[PDB]
Amino acid sequence: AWNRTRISNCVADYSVLYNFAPFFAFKCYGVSPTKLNDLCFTNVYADSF
Amino acid sequence: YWYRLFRKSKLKPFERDISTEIYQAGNKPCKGKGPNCYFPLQSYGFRPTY
Ligand SMILES: *[C@@H]1O[C@H](CO)[C@@H](O)[C@H](O)[C@H]1NC(C)=O
């Protein structure tokens, strides 16, 4: 039962959090942002596992 | 029969990948675990039952 983490109408700058926790399995299959602040998109379908 | 999962060199037309060292993914020298780094060679399960 993943969380509806709807990332819309804001700047998805979650790359700073890379330094907050030691992210180990960083498999970005379509886009690999070490910084993420520009594009606006409709649907994100973010999930928590 | 494995494949180059990661590499630190952008591929261009008619060029071969040879280096298989750990793909460094952090500003600090990354060797193995810790940062996002992983071994860039995953085994393919070529089974006849698949
Ligand atoms: C959350 O923030 C704390 C510091 O307040 C940090 O130690 C921890 O790793 C962070 N976790 C994530 C996933 O951001």
PDB file of N, CA and C and ligand atoms in Angstrom:
ATOM      1  N   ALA A   1       0.826  -1.202   0.000  1.00  0.00           N
ATOM      2  CA  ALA A   1       0.000   0.000   0.000  1.00  0.00           C
ATOM      3  C   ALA A   1       0.864   1.258   0.000  1.00  0.00           C
ATOM      4  N   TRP A   2       1.387   1.624  -1.168  1.00  0.00           N
ATOM      5  CA  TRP A   2       2.259   2.786  -1.267  1.00  0.00           C
ATOM      6  C   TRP A   2       1.489   4.066  -0.968  1.00  0.00           C
ATOM      7  N   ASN A   3       2.243   5.045  -0.453  1.00  0.00           N
ATOM      8  CA  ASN A   3       1.760   6.413  -0.135  1.00  0.00           C
ATOM      9  C   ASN A   3       1.570   7.209  -1.422  1.00  0.00           C
ATOM     10  N   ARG A   4       0.496   7.996  -1.493  1.00  0.00           N
ATOM     11  CA  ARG A   4       0.346   8.923  -2.613  1.00  0.00           C
ATOM     12  C   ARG A   4       1.220  10.139  -2.333  1.00  0.00           C
ATOM     13  N   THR A   5       2.500  10.024  -2.679  1.00  0.00           N
ATOM     14  CA  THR A   5       3.448  11.128  -2.545  1.00  0.00           C
ATOM     15  C   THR A   5       3.356  11.972  -3.809  1.00  0.00           C
ATOM     16  N   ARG A   6       2.296  12.770  -3.908  1.00  0.00           N
ATOM     17  CA  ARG A   6       2.045  13.557  -5.107  1.00  0.00           C
ATOM     18  C   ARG A   6       2.954  14.779  -5.133  1.00  0.00           C
ATOM     19  N   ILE A   7       3.983  14.726  -5.974  1.00  0.00           N
ATOM     20  CA  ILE A   7       4.951  15.804  -6.130  1.00  0.00           C
ATOM     21  C   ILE A   7       4.502  16.683  -7.287  1.00  0.00           C
ATOM     22  N   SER A   8       3.688  17.690  -6.985  1.00  0.00           N
ATOM     23  CA  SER A   8       3.186  18.580  -8.022  1.00  0.00           C
ATOM     24  C   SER A   8       3.196  20.009  -7.502  1.00  0.00           C
ATOM     25  N   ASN A   9       3.346  20.948  -8.437  1.00  0.00           N
ATOM     26  CA  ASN A   9       3.309  22.383  -8.156  1.00  0.00           C
ATOM     27  C   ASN A   9       4.320  22.769  -7.072  1.00  0.00           C
ATOM     28  N   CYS A  10       5.498  22.168  -7.161  1.00  0.00           N
ATOM     29  CA  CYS A  10       6.620  22.515  -6.292  1.00  0.00           C
ATOM     30  C   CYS A  10       7.897  22.071  -6.997  1.00  0.00           C
ATOM     31  N   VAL A  11       9.041  22.419  -6.416  1.00  0.00           N
ATOM     32  CA  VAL A  11      10.345  22.091  -6.978  1.00  0.00           C
ATOM     33  C   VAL A  11      10.824  20.804  -6.322  1.00  0.00           C
ATOM     34  N   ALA A  12      10.937  19.741  -7.118  1.00  0.00           N
ATOM     35  CA  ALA A  12      11.276  18.417  -6.601  1.00  0.00           C
ATOM     36  C   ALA A  12      12.779  18.306  -6.330  1.00  0.00           C
ATOM     37  N   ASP A  13      13.253  19.168  -5.429  1.00  0.00           N
ATOM     38  CA  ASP A  13      14.668  19.213  -5.067  1.00  0.00           C
ATOM     39  C   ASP A  13      14.876  18.308  -3.855  1.00  0.00           C
ATOM     40  N   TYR A  14      14.830  17.004  -4.114  1.00  0.00           N
ATOM     41  CA  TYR A  14      15.098  15.981  -3.114  1.00  0.00           C
ATOM     42  C   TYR A  14      16.536  15.486  -3.168  1.00  0.00           C
ATOM     43  N   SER A  15      17.375  16.111  -3.997  1.00  0.00           N
ATOM     44  CA  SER A  15      18.754  15.663  -4.142  1.00  0.00           C
ATOM     45  C   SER A  15      19.604  16.033  -2.934  1.00  0.00           C
ATOM     46  N   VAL A  16      19.214  17.072  -2.193  1.00  0.00           N
ATOM     47  CA  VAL A  16      19.946  17.412  -0.977  1.00  0.00           C
ATOM     48  C   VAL A  16      19.830  16.289   0.045  1.00  0.00           C
ATOM     49  N   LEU A  17      18.674  15.623   0.099  1.00  0.00           N
ATOM     50  CA  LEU A  17      18.467  14.520   1.027  1.00  0.00           C
ATOM     51  C   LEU A  17      19.408  13.353   0.766  1.00  0.00           C
ATOM     52  N   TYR A  18      20.055  13.311  -0.403  1.00  0.00           N
ATOM     53  CA  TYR A  18      21.095  12.315  -0.640  1.00  0.00           C
ATOM     54  C   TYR A  18      22.165  12.374   0.440  1.00  0.00           C
ATOM     55  N   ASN A  19      22.447  13.566   0.964  1.00  0.00           N
ATOM     56  CA  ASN A  19      23.422  13.718   2.034  1.00  0.00           C
ATOM     57  C   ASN A  19      22.849  13.442   3.416  1.00  0.00           C
ATOM     58  N   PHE A  20      21.521  13.427   3.559  1.00  0.00           N
ATOM     59  CA  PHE A  20      20.929  13.185   4.872  1.00  0.00           C
ATOM     60  C   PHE A  20      21.032  11.717   5.265  1.00  0.00           C
ATOM     61  N   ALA A  21      20.811  10.812   4.315  1.00  0.00           N
ATOM     62  CA  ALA A  21      20.888   9.386   4.584  1.00  0.00           C
ATOM     63  C   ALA A  21      21.788   8.712   3.562  1.00  0.00           C
ATOM     64  N   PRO A  22      22.505   7.652   3.941  1.00  0.00           N
ATOM     65  CA  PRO A  22      23.393   6.985   2.980  1.00  0.00           C
ATOM     66  C   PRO A  22      22.628   6.120   1.993  1.00  0.00           C
ATOM     67  N   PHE A  23      22.114   6.731   0.927  1.00  0.00           N
ATOM     68  CA  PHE A  23      21.352   5.985  -0.066  1.00  0.00           C
ATOM     69  C   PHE A  23      22.253   4.970  -0.759  1.00  0.00           C
ATOM     70  N   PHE A  24      21.914   3.688  -0.623  1.00  0.00           N
ATOM     71  CA  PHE A  24      22.733   2.612  -1.165  1.00  0.00           C
ATOM     72  C   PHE A  24      22.280   2.138  -2.537  1.00  0.00           C
ATOM     73  N   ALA A  25      21.038   1.683  -2.667  1.00  0.00           N
ATOM     74  CA  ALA A  25      20.497   1.173  -3.924  1.00  0.00           C
ATOM     75  C   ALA A  25      19.860   2.348  -4.659  1.00  0.00           C
ATOM     76  N   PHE A  26      20.684   3.103  -5.380  1.00  0.00           N
ATOM     77  CA  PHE A  26      20.266   4.281  -6.136  1.00  0.00           C
ATOM     78  C   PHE A  26      20.162   3.891  -7.608  1.00  0.00           C
ATOM     79  N   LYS A  27      19.092   3.187  -7.970  1.00  0.00           N
ATOM     80  CA  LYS A  27      18.871   2.787  -9.353  1.00  0.00           C
ATOM     81  C   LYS A  27      17.848   3.707 -10.000  1.00  0.00           C
ATOM     82  N   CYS A  28      18.341   4.730 -10.691  1.00  0.00           N
ATOM     83  CA  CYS A  28      17.498   5.647 -11.454  1.00  0.00           C
ATOM     84  C   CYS A  28      17.527   5.193 -12.908  1.00  0.00           C
ATOM     85  N   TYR A  29      16.421   4.612 -13.363  1.00  0.00           N
ATOM     86  CA  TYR A  29      16.375   3.950 -14.658  1.00  0.00           C
ATOM     87  C   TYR A  29      16.079   4.898 -15.814  1.00  0.00           C
ATOM     88  N   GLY A  30      15.349   5.987 -15.578  1.00  0.00           N
ATOM     89  CA  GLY A  30      15.025   6.907 -16.651  1.00  0.00           C
ATOM     90  C   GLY A  30      15.707   8.257 -16.550  1.00  0.00           C
ATOM     91  N   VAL A  31      15.853   8.771 -15.330  1.00  0.00           N
ATOM     92  CA  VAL A  31      16.517  10.045 -15.081  1.00  0.00           C
ATOM     93  C   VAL A  31      17.254   9.923 -13.753  1.00  0.00           C
ATOM     94  N   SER A  32      18.483  10.435 -13.696  1.00  0.00           N
ATOM     95  CA  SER A  32      19.347  10.296 -12.521  1.00  0.00           C
ATOM     96  C   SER A  32      19.786  11.674 -12.038  1.00  0.00           C
ATOM     97  N   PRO A  33      18.900  12.404 -11.359  1.00  0.00           N
ATOM     98  CA  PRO A  33      19.244  13.767 -10.938  1.00  0.00           C
ATOM     99  C   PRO A  33      20.059  13.818  -9.655  1.00  0.00           C
ATOM    100  N   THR A  34      21.267  14.384  -9.731  1.00  0.00           N
ATOM    101  CA  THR A  34      21.966  14.787  -8.516  1.00  0.00           C
ATOM    102  C   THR A  34      21.491  16.160  -8.063  1.00  0.00           C
ATOM    103  N   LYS A  35      20.561  16.741  -8.813  1.00  0.00           N
ATOM    104  CA  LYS A  35      19.858  17.991  -8.527  1.00  0.00           C
ATOM    105  C   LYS A  35      18.645  18.115  -9.444  1.00  0.00           C
ATOM    106  N   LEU A  36      17.523  18.636  -8.943  1.00  0.00           N
ATOM    107  CA  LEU A  36      16.258  18.509  -9.668  1.00  0.00           C
ATOM    108  C   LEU A  36      15.335  19.673  -9.303  1.00  0.00           C
ATOM    109  N   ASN A  37      15.318  20.687 -10.175  1.00  0.00           N
ATOM    110  CA  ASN A  37      14.611  21.919  -9.833  1.00  0.00           C
ATOM    111  C   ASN A  37      13.848  22.607 -10.962  1.00  0.00           C
ATOM    112  N   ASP A  38      13.716  22.033 -12.160  1.00  0.00           N
ATOM    113  CA  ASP A  38      13.202  22.853 -13.255  1.00  0.00           C
ATOM    114  C   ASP A  38      11.832  22.418 -13.767  1.00  0.00           C
ATOM    115  N   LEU A  39      11.696  21.197 -14.277  1.00  0.00           N
ATOM    116  CA  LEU A  39      10.535  20.834 -15.081  1.00  0.00           C
ATOM    117  C   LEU A  39       9.292  20.665 -14.218  1.00  0.00           C
ATOM    118  N   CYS A  40       8.145  21.062 -14.760  1.00  0.00           N
ATOM    119  CA  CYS A  40       6.850  20.843 -14.131  1.00  0.00           C
ATOM    120  C   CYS A  40       6.160  19.685 -14.835  1.00  0.00           C
ATOM    121  N   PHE A  41       5.594  18.770 -14.053  1.00  0.00           N
ATOM    122  CA  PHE A  41       4.968  17.575 -14.600  1.00  0.00           C
ATOM    123  C   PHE A  41       3.644  17.335 -13.892  1.00  0.00           C
ATOM    124  N   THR A  42       2.761  16.589 -14.558  1.00  0.00           N
ATOM    125  CA  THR A  42       1.419  16.358 -14.022  1.00  0.00           C
ATOM    126  C   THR A  42       1.413  15.236 -12.986  1.00  0.00           C
ATOM    127  N   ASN A  43       1.782  14.027 -13.398  1.00  0.00           N
ATOM    128  CA  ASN A  43       1.667  12.847 -12.553  1.00  0.00           C
ATOM    129  C   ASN A  43       3.046  12.335 -12.158  1.00  0.00           C
ATOM    130  N   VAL A  44       3.181  11.928 -10.893  1.00  0.00           N
ATOM    131  CA  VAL A  44       4.440  11.435 -10.356  1.00  0.00           C
ATOM    132  C   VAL A  44       4.352   9.976  -9.927  1.00  0.00           C
ATOM    133  N   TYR A  45       3.186   9.542  -9.441  1.00  0.00           N
ATOM    134  CA  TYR A  45       2.973   8.199  -8.893  1.00  0.00           C
ATOM    135  C   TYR A  45       4.171   7.725  -8.068  1.00  0.00           C
ATOM    136  N   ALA A  46       4.521   8.525  -7.065  1.00  0.00           N
ATOM    137  CA  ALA A  46       5.615   8.160  -6.175  1.00  0.00           C
ATOM    138  C   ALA A  46       5.150   7.112  -5.173  1.00  0.00           C
ATOM    139  N   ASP A  47       6.067   6.231  -4.782  1.00  0.00           N
ATOM    140  CA  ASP A  47       5.758   5.089  -3.934  1.00  0.00           C
ATOM    141  C   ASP A  47       6.752   5.014  -2.785  1.00  0.00           C
ATOM    142  N   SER A  48       6.310   4.444  -1.667  1.00  0.00           N
ATOM    143  CA  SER A  48       7.150   4.224  -0.498  1.00  0.00           C
ATOM    144  C   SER A  48       7.161   2.738  -0.168  1.00  0.00           C
ATOM    145  N   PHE A  49       8.356   2.182   0.021  1.00  0.00           N
ATOM    146  CA  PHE A  49       8.542   0.753   0.227  1.00  0.00           C
ATOM    147  C   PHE A  49       9.436   0.506   1.436  1.00  0.00           C
TER     148      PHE A  49
ATOM    149  N   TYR B   1      27.486 -14.894 -19.191  1.00  0.00           N
ATOM    150  CA  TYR B   1      27.195 -13.822 -20.141  1.00  0.00           C
ATOM    151  C   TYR B   1      26.654 -12.629 -19.367  1.00  0.00           C
ATOM    152  N   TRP B   2      27.539 -11.702 -19.022  1.00  0.00           N
ATOM    153  CA  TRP B   2      27.207 -10.552 -18.200  1.00  0.00           C
ATOM    154  C   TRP B   2      27.147  -9.304 -19.079  1.00  0.00           C
ATOM    155  N   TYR B   3      26.925  -8.152 -18.450  1.00  0.00           N
ATOM    156  CA  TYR B   3      26.818  -6.903 -19.188  1.00  0.00           C
ATOM    157  C   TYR B   3      27.347  -5.763 -18.332  1.00  0.00           C
ATOM    158  N   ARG B   4      27.816  -4.713 -19.003  1.00  0.00           N
ATOM    159  CA  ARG B   4      28.362  -3.538 -18.331  1.00  0.00           C
ATOM    160  C   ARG B   4      27.206  -2.733 -17.757  1.00  0.00           C
ATOM    161  N   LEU B   5      26.851  -3.019 -16.502  1.00  0.00           N
ATOM    162  CA  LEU B   5      25.741  -2.316 -15.867  1.00  0.00           C
ATOM    163  C   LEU B   5      26.026  -0.822 -15.757  1.00  0.00           C
ATOM    164  N   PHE B   6      27.235  -0.465 -15.328  1.00  0.00           N
ATOM    165  CA  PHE B   6      27.641   0.926 -15.191  1.00  0.00           C
ATOM    166  C   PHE B   6      29.051   1.093 -15.738  1.00  0.00           C
ATOM    167  N   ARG B   7      29.387   2.331 -16.088  1.00  0.00           N
ATOM    168  CA  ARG B   7      30.722   2.652 -16.572  1.00  0.00           C
ATOM    169  C   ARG B   7      30.912   4.157 -16.450  1.00  0.00           C
ATOM    170  N   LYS B   8      32.170   4.581 -16.315  1.00  0.00           N
ATOM    171  CA  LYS B   8      32.506   5.987 -16.119  1.00  0.00           C
ATOM    172  C   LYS B   8      32.943   6.668 -17.411  1.00  0.00           C
ATOM    173  N   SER B   9      32.520   6.145 -18.560  1.00  0.00           N
ATOM    174  CA  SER B   9      32.875   6.735 -19.844  1.00  0.00           C
ATOM    175  C   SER B   9      31.670   6.670 -20.770  1.00  0.00           C
ATOM    176  N   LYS B  10      31.319   7.810 -21.359  1.00  0.00           N
ATOM    177  CA  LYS B  10      30.198   7.873 -22.288  1.00  0.00           C
ATOM    178  C   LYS B  10      30.546   7.132 -23.572  1.00  0.00           C
ATOM    179  N   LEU B  11      29.659   6.235 -23.993  1.00  0.00           N
ATOM    180  CA  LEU B  11      29.897   5.465 -25.203  1.00  0.00           C
ATOM    181  C   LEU B  11      29.581   6.292 -26.445  1.00  0.00           C
ATOM    182  N   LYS B  12      30.397   6.097 -27.470  1.00  0.00           N
ATOM    183  CA  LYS B  12      30.261   6.741 -28.765  1.00  0.00           C
ATOM    184  C   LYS B  12      30.138   5.662 -29.828  1.00  0.00           C
ATOM    185  N   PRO B  13      29.667   6.015 -31.026  1.00  0.00           N
ATOM    186  CA  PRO B  13      29.541   5.009 -32.088  1.00  0.00           C
ATOM    187  C   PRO B  13      30.859   4.297 -32.362  1.00  0.00           C
ATOM    188  N   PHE B  14      30.766   2.978 -32.543  1.00  0.00           N
ATOM    189  CA  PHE B  14      31.916   2.126 -32.854  1.00  0.00           C
ATOM    190  C   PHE B  14      33.005   2.240 -31.790  1.00  0.00           C
ATOM    191  N   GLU B  15      32.630   2.008 -30.536  1.00  0.00           N
ATOM    192  CA  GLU B  15      33.574   1.982 -29.429  1.00  0.00           C
ATOM    193  C   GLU B  15      33.174   0.875 -28.465  1.00  0.00           C
ATOM    194  N   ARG B  16      34.169   0.237 -27.858  1.00  0.00           N
ATOM    195  CA  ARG B  16      33.954  -0.913 -26.995  1.00  0.00           C
ATOM    196  C   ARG B  16      34.249  -0.546 -25.546  1.00  0.00           C
ATOM    197  N   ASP B  17      33.493  -1.146 -24.631  1.00  0.00           N
ATOM    198  CA  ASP B  17      33.705  -0.984 -23.199  1.00  0.00           C
ATOM    199  C   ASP B  17      34.623  -2.086 -22.683  1.00  0.00           C
ATOM    200  N   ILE B  18      35.708  -1.686 -22.026  1.00  0.00           N
ATOM    201  CA  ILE B  18      36.703  -2.618 -21.517  1.00  0.00           C
ATOM    202  C   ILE B  18      36.864  -2.501 -20.007  1.00  0.00           C
ATOM    203  N   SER B  19      36.973  -1.279 -19.490  1.00  0.00           N
ATOM    204  CA  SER B  19      37.177  -1.084 -18.061  1.00  0.00           C
ATOM    205  C   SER B  19      35.996  -1.632 -17.270  1.00  0.00           C
ATOM    206  N   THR B  20      36.297  -2.453 -16.262  1.00  0.00           N
ATOM    207  CA  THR B  20      35.277  -3.045 -15.408  1.00  0.00           C
ATOM    208  C   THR B  20      35.473  -2.679 -13.942  1.00  0.00           C
ATOM    209  N   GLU B  21      36.272  -1.656 -13.650  1.00  0.00           N
ATOM    210  CA  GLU B  21      36.468  -1.216 -12.279  1.00  0.00           C
ATOM    211  C   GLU B  21      35.157  -0.701 -11.694  1.00  0.00           C
ATOM    212  N   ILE B  22      35.125  -0.600 -10.362  1.00  0.00           N
ATOM    213  CA  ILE B  22      33.917  -0.152  -9.681  1.00  0.00           C
ATOM    214  C   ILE B  22      33.540   1.237 -10.177  1.00  0.00           C
ATOM    215  N   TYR B  23      32.277   1.397 -10.560  1.00  0.00           N
ATOM    216  CA  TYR B  23      31.799   2.666 -11.098  1.00  0.00           C
ATOM    217  C   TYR B  23      31.662   3.673  -9.966  1.00  0.00           C
ATOM    218  N   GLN B  24      32.611   4.602  -9.877  1.00  0.00           N
ATOM    219  CA  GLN B  24      32.582   5.615  -8.832  1.00  0.00           C
ATOM    220  C   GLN B  24      31.393   6.544  -9.048  1.00  0.00           C
ATOM    221  N   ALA B  25      30.589   6.731  -8.002  1.00  0.00           N
ATOM    222  CA  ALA B  25      29.401   7.567  -8.076  1.00  0.00           C
ATOM    223  C   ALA B  25      29.410   8.717  -7.080  1.00  0.00           C
ATOM    224  N   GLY B  26      30.478   8.879  -6.307  1.00  0.00           N
ATOM    225  CA  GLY B  26      30.575   9.953  -5.340  1.00  0.00           C
ATOM    226  C   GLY B  26      31.830  10.774  -5.560  1.00  0.00           C
ATOM    227  N   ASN B  27      31.811  12.008  -5.047  1.00  0.00           N
ATOM    228  CA  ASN B  27      32.986  12.868  -5.147  1.00  0.00           C
ATOM    229  C   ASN B  27      34.180  12.266  -4.418  1.00  0.00           C
ATOM    230  N   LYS B  28      33.960  11.711  -3.229  1.00  0.00           N
ATOM    231  CA  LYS B  28      34.994  10.935  -2.570  1.00  0.00           C
ATOM    232  C   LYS B  28      35.278   9.677  -3.389  1.00  0.00           C
ATOM    233  N   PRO B  29      36.515   9.165  -3.357  1.00  0.00           N
ATOM    234  CA  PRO B  29      36.811   7.935  -4.106  1.00  0.00           C
ATOM    235  C   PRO B  29      35.936   6.782  -3.646  1.00  0.00           C
ATOM    236  N   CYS B  30      35.052   6.325  -4.528  1.00  0.00           N
ATOM    237  CA  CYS B  30      34.044   5.334  -4.177  1.00  0.00           C
ATOM    238  C   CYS B  30      34.492   3.960  -4.659  1.00  0.00           C
ATOM    239  N   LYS B  31      34.654   3.029  -3.719  1.00  0.00           N
ATOM    240  CA  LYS B  31      35.109   1.673  -4.022  1.00  0.00           C
ATOM    241  C   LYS B  31      34.187   0.696  -3.298  1.00  0.00           C
ATOM    242  N   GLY B  32      33.220   0.146  -4.022  1.00  0.00           N
ATOM    243  CA  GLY B  32      32.312  -0.824  -3.443  1.00  0.00           C
ATOM    244  C   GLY B  32      31.036  -0.200  -2.912  1.00  0.00           C
ATOM    245  N   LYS B  33      30.695  -0.597  -1.689  1.00  0.00           N
ATOM    246  CA  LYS B  33      29.475  -0.138  -1.036  1.00  0.00           C
ATOM    247  C   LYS B  33      29.678   1.272  -0.484  1.00  0.00           C
ATOM    248  N   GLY B  34      28.718   1.741   0.308  1.00  0.00           N
ATOM    249  CA  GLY B  34      28.724   3.097   0.798  1.00  0.00           C
ATOM    250  C   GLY B  34      27.860   3.989  -0.068  1.00  0.00           C
ATOM    251  N   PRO B  35      28.485   4.719  -0.987  1.00  0.00           N
ATOM    252  CA  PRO B  35      27.707   5.467  -1.983  1.00  0.00           C
ATOM    253  C   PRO B  35      26.987   4.542  -2.954  1.00  0.00           C
ATOM    254  N   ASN B  36      26.320   5.129  -3.946  1.00  0.00           N
ATOM    255  CA  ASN B  36      25.480   4.405  -4.895  1.00  0.00           C
ATOM    256  C   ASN B  36      26.221   3.330  -5.686  1.00  0.00           C
ATOM    257  N   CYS B  37      27.541   3.248  -5.524  1.00  0.00           N
ATOM    258  CA  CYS B  37      28.360   2.372  -6.352  1.00  0.00           C
ATOM    259  C   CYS B  37      27.954   0.912  -6.183  1.00  0.00           C
ATOM    260  N   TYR B  38      28.044   0.164  -7.281  1.00  0.00           N
ATOM    261  CA  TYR B  38      27.827  -1.275  -7.279  1.00  0.00           C
ATOM    262  C   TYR B  38      28.660  -1.894  -8.392  1.00  0.00           C
ATOM    263  N   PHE B  39      28.828  -3.208  -8.320  1.00  0.00           N
ATOM    264  CA  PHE B  39      29.620  -3.916  -9.320  1.00  0.00           C
ATOM    265  C   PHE B  39      28.904  -3.865 -10.663  1.00  0.00           C
ATOM    266  N   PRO B  40      29.545  -3.375 -11.723  1.00  0.00           N
ATOM    267  CA  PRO B  40      28.840  -3.197 -12.997  1.00  0.00           C
ATOM    268  C   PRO B  40      28.816  -4.457 -13.848  1.00  0.00           C
ATOM    269  N   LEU B  41      28.462  -5.587 -13.242  1.00  0.00           N
ATOM    270  CA  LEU B  41      28.436  -6.865 -13.950  1.00  0.00           C
ATOM    271  C   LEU B  41      27.423  -7.771 -13.268  1.00  0.00           C
ATOM    272  N   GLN B  42      26.243  -7.910 -13.866  1.00  0.00           N
ATOM    273  CA  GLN B  42      25.175  -8.738 -13.322  1.00  0.00           C
ATOM    274  C   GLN B  42      25.010  -9.985 -14.177  1.00  0.00           C
ATOM    275  N   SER B  43      24.944 -11.141 -13.521  1.00  0.00           N
ATOM    276  CA  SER B  43      24.794 -12.401 -14.233  1.00  0.00           C
ATOM    277  C   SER B  43      23.396 -12.531 -14.826  1.00  0.00           C
ATOM    278  N   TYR B  44      23.336 -13.003 -16.069  1.00  0.00           N
ATOM    279  CA  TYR B  44      22.072 -13.340 -16.709  1.00  0.00           C
ATOM    280  C   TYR B  44      21.743 -14.803 -16.453  1.00  0.00           C
ATOM    281  N   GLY B  45      20.544 -15.052 -15.935  1.00  0.00           N
ATOM    282  CA  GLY B  45      20.104 -16.406 -15.670  1.00  0.00           C
ATOM    283  C   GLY B  45      19.602 -17.109 -16.913  1.00  0.00           C
ATOM    284  N   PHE B  46      20.518 -17.482 -17.803  1.00  0.00           N
ATOM    285  CA  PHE B  46      20.139 -18.148 -19.044  1.00  0.00           C
ATOM    286  C   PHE B  46      19.748 -19.589 -18.747  1.00  0.00           C
ATOM    287  N   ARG B  47      18.505 -19.786 -18.309  1.00  0.00           N
ATOM    288  CA  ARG B  47      17.961 -21.102 -18.049  1.00  0.00           C
ATOM    289  C   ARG B  47      17.119 -21.557 -19.235  1.00  0.00           C
ATOM    290  N   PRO B  48      17.111 -22.856 -19.548  1.00  0.00           N
ATOM    291  CA  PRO B  48      16.195 -23.354 -20.581  1.00  0.00           C
ATOM    292  C   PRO B  48      14.754 -23.457 -20.113  1.00  0.00           C
ATOM    293  N   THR B  49      14.499 -23.311 -18.814  1.00  0.00           N
ATOM    294  CA  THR B  49      13.153 -23.353 -18.262  1.00  0.00           C
ATOM    295  C   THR B  49      12.465 -21.993 -18.264  1.00  0.00           C
ATOM    296  N   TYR B  50      13.179 -20.924 -18.610  1.00  0.00           N
ATOM    297  CA  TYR B  50      12.570 -19.604 -18.657  1.00  0.00           C
ATOM    298  C   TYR B  50      11.701 -19.457 -19.906  1.00  0.00           C
TER     299      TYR B  50
HETATM  300  C1  LIG C   1      16.489  12.511   7.936  1.00  0.00           C
HETATM  301  O1  LIG C   1      17.170  13.601   8.547  1.00  0.00           O
HETATM  302  C2  LIG C   1      18.116  13.109   9.494  1.00  0.00           C
HETATM  303  C3  LIG C   1      18.776  14.283  10.200  1.00  0.00           C
HETATM  304  O2  LIG C   1      17.768  15.096  10.809  1.00  0.00           O
HETATM  305  C4  LIG C   1      19.149  12.256   8.769  1.00  0.00           C
HETATM  306  O3  LIG C   1      20.133  11.786   9.693  1.00  0.00           O
HETATM  307  C5  LIG C   1      18.451  11.074   8.118  1.00  0.00           C
HETATM  308  O4  LIG C   1      19.380  10.221   7.448  1.00  0.00           O
HETATM  309  C6  LIG C   1      17.443  11.638   7.137  1.00  0.00           C
HETATM  310  N1  LIG C   1      16.749  10.584   6.429  1.00  0.00           N
HETATM  311  C7  LIG C   1      16.306  10.788   5.194  1.00  0.00           C
HETATM  312  C8  LIG C   1      15.818   9.568   4.474  1.00  0.00           C
HETATM  313  O5  LIG C   1      16.297  11.895   4.679  1.00  0.00           O
END
